[PDB]
Each structure stands twice: as structure tokens, then as C-alpha cells.
Design a binder for this molecule. Structure first.
Ligand SMILES: [Br-]
Ligand SMILES: [Br-]
Ligand SMILES: [Br-]
Ligand SMILES: [Br-]
Ligand SMILES: [Br-]
Ligand SMILES: [Br-]
Ligand SMILES: [Br-]
Ligand SMILES: [Br-]
Ligand SMILES: [Br-]
Ligand SMILES: [Br-]
Lengths: 123, 18
């Protein structure tokens, strides 16, 4: 399946900051690579073939990861949906996405639960 | 353009979350 690289995650964040606003820059050099590398390793190791579970893992990992000074939630959401789109899943905006992403970010909504919602919306 | 199209699609939610 087609994954999102750390540098792509960063570029997506930076483009989002430019378009919508927010504080620039990364919290800690290396964290993007650490987190996204972890996601991809886990997907291989756990043999996760379900696109919605994988999208959810990107979403939760970035939302909780504090890779950036700002727009972590935006980057989390857009990257998850970019992931779905690259893998042939049509995506569209839904008024449920904001609260979903916040819930993921605060640790209130698990990967499994995020995947369940994405699957309802887009599957 | 990869990103611009994605942001266009999710423009509402992106704005909401700022
Ligand atoms: Br930035
Ligand atoms: Br970083
Ligand atoms: Br992970
Ligand atoms: Br945000
Ligand atoms: Br943030
Ligand atoms: Br909407
Ligand atoms: Br979780
Ligand atoms: Br853009
Ligand atoms: Br644009
Ligand atoms: Br799109």
C-alpha cells in the first residue's frame, strides 16, 4: 500500500500552515521520522491490510505526537485522508471530522474507534 | 497540487480547526 513519508508529512504540514495559518516549525528534529517510521513498521509487523485501520494509525500517531509547534491536528486529519485518497478511497469533508480529530488528539478515541468512524464515512 | 486539491476538499474543516 502507498504510505506517507516523514518529509511528505512535514511538507503537508508546512503547506497547511501557509494556507490556513499557525505557528511554523517542528517541536523536535527527528520526531516526524520516529513517529511515521513507527507507524509503517507496525503496519508491516502487525500485517495491517485494512486501509481504515492504517489511516486511523496515521491520524492518531500525528494527532498525539506533537511533531509540530502547531497544526498537529490539521496535519493528522489531512494526512490520514491523503493516505486514503492515494490508496483509491474517495474522501470528502464531513462535519464529524473536527471532533473526531480532537478526540484522537486528547487520547479519548482509540485507533480502532477512529478507524470505525472513517470506515463508516468513506468505506 | 497534491495538497491544494486535498485542502480544497477539506477546506471547511481546515478552517474550523484553526
Ligand atoms: Br511550518
Ligand atoms: Br521533526
Ligand atoms: Br503507531
Ligand atoms: Br490544528
Ligand atoms: Br496543534
Ligand atoms: Br463539511
Ligand atoms: Br490507540
Ligand atoms: Br497547498
Ligand atoms: Br492552494
Ligand atoms: Br481530494
Amino acid at each position: 500500500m502507498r504510505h506517507i513519508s516523514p518529509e511528505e508529512l512535514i511538507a503537508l504540514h508546512d503547506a497547511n500552515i501557509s494556507r490556513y495559518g499557525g505557528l511554523p516549525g517542528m517541536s523536535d528534529p527527528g520526531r516526524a521520522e520516529a513517529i511515521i517510521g513507527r507507524v509503517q513498521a507496525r503496519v508491516a509487523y502487525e500485517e495491517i491490510t485494512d486501509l481504515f485501520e492504517v489511516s486511523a494509525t496515521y491520524l492518531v500517531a500525528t494527532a498525539r505526537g506533537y511533531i509540530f509547534n502547531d497544526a498537529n491536528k490539521r496535519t493528522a486529519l489531512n494526512s490520514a485522508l491523503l493516505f486514503l485518497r492515494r490508496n483509491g478511497v474517495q474522501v470528502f469533508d464531513s462535519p464529524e471530522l473536527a471532533d473526531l480529530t480532537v478526540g484522537a488528539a486528547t487520547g479519548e478515541i482509540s485507533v480502532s474507534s477512529v478507524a470505525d468512524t472513517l470506515r463508516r464515512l468513506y468505506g | 497540487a497534491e495538497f491544494a486539491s486535498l485542502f480544497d476538499t477539506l477546506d471547511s474543516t481546515n478552517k474550523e480547526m484553526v
